[PDB]
Amino acid sequence: HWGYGKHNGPEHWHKDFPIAKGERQSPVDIDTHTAKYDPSLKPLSVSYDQATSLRILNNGHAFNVEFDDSQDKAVLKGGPLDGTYRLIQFHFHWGSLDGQGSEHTVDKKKYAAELHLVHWNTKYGDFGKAVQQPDGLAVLGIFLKVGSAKPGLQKVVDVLDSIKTKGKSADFTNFDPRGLLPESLDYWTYPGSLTTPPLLECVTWIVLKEPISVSSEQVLKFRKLNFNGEGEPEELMVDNWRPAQPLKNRQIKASFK
Ligand SMILES: NS(=O)(=O)c1ccc(O)c(NC(=O)NCCCCO)c1
Ligand SMILES: [Zn+2]
């Protein structure tokens, strides 16, 4: 099965998922001088006031905080998107060291981690249909740098002891994802893919310019999770990021100068 090790990591994925070598793969390096400011880009509309978090799950590759997506409760609109996209889950990718962990890079700079708020286009009816469409998902990507703590992340950090190993889940209600957002919603955007298998080319990526700061203790607690299931040999869940992929025939657009 695929993963992030020496024998099943990102350089192996194409053998089971040939789209790994496709034309719109993610993540990418964001060359800030080559991105083009698009003044027609609209401000992002993040409407998370009615969000209903349900549960947090260790799936063996990351942890997902899952939301009720059966109504328009937490939606992303505007920006480059047409229509309404519903929040289904968020998760992170992170490193073994503070100098690495993000999937996207900014002028080759790697951040300590990257948050992915995953949304699907309501015109396709459900997430499974949406991932089969070139405009099916919108993933809002937010970089994490190590510095001051992020208070809105702490409820996530504190529950991780309950989901240490693959397949463990915990109730996780009343979590407000607005506590994970930076001040500015300035963003870069480009067409891309899921960054884990099945690597489907269904994502409008929206990557925020401004990182959030989290404390060293917060990211340390991410690194105590396990890729393995309970009663299996312990592999720390670290470096669960795919490196930057070729940009090919794509232009990254910026909502700001
Ligand atoms: N990193 S991402 O581009 O924001 C991303 C957003 C939504 C996704 O569905 C995936 N891929 C995925 O879930 N693959 C199957 C493993 C889960 C079952 O345990 C990746
Ligand atoms: Zn992700």
From Swiss-Prot:
The record lists substrate as bound by: T195, T196
The UniProt annotation places Zn(2+) binding at H91, H93, H116
Q: Which domain of life is it from?
A: Eukaryota
Its localization reads: Cytoplasm; Cell membrane
Per UniProt, what does mutating H61A do?
Reduced CO(2) hydrase activity, rescued by 4-methylimidazole (4-MI). Reduced proton transfer. Enhanced proton transfer. Enhanced proton transfer capacity
- Which CDD domains does the record match to this protein? alpha_CA_I_II_III_XIII
Cite the GO molecular-function annotations of the record: arylesterase activity; carbonate dehydratase activity; cyanamide hydratase activity; zinc ion binding
GO cellular component labels: apical part of cell; cytoplasm; cytosol; extracellular exosome; myelin sheath; plasma membrane
Name the consequence of W2A. Answer: Impaired activity, not rescued by 4-methylimidazole (4-MI)
Cofactor annotation remark: Zinc. Can also use cobalt(II) with lower efficiency, but not copper(II), nickel(II) and manganese(II).
What residues does the record give for site: Fine-tunes the proton-transfer properties of H-64?
Y4, N59, N64
Q: Which cofactor does it need?
A: Zn(2+); Co(2+)
Which SUPFAM superfamilies did the record assign?
A: Carbonic anhydrase
Q: PROSITE patterns attached here?
A: ALPHA_CA_1 (PS00162), ALPHA_CA_2 (PS51144)
Q: Which SMART domains match?
A: Carb_anhydrase (SM01057)
Domain Alpha-carbonic anhydrase per the UniProt entry, residue ranges:
1-256
Q: What reaction does this enzyme carry out catalytically?
A: hydrogencarbonate + H(+) = CO2 + H2O; urea = cyanamide + H2O
According to the record, mutating N59V results in: Reduced activity
Q: Which residues form the active site?
A: H61 (proton donor/acceptor)
Q: Which disease is it linked to?
A: Osteopetrosis, autosomal recessive 3: A rare genetic disease characterized by abnormally dense bone, due to defective resorption of immature bone. Osteopetrosis occurs in two forms: a severe autosomal recessive form occurring in utero, infancy, or childhood, and a benign autosomal dominant form occurring in adolescence or adulthood. Recessive osteopetrosis commonly manifests in early infancy with macrocephaly, feeding difficulties, evolving blindness and deafness, bone marrow failure, severe anemia, and hepatosplenomegaly.
Supply any other comment. Answer: Target of drugs used in treatments against glaucoma disorder and breast cancer.
Family stated for the protein in its record = Belongs to the alpha-carbonic anhydrase family.
Q: Supply the name of the protein.
A: Carbonic anhydrase 2
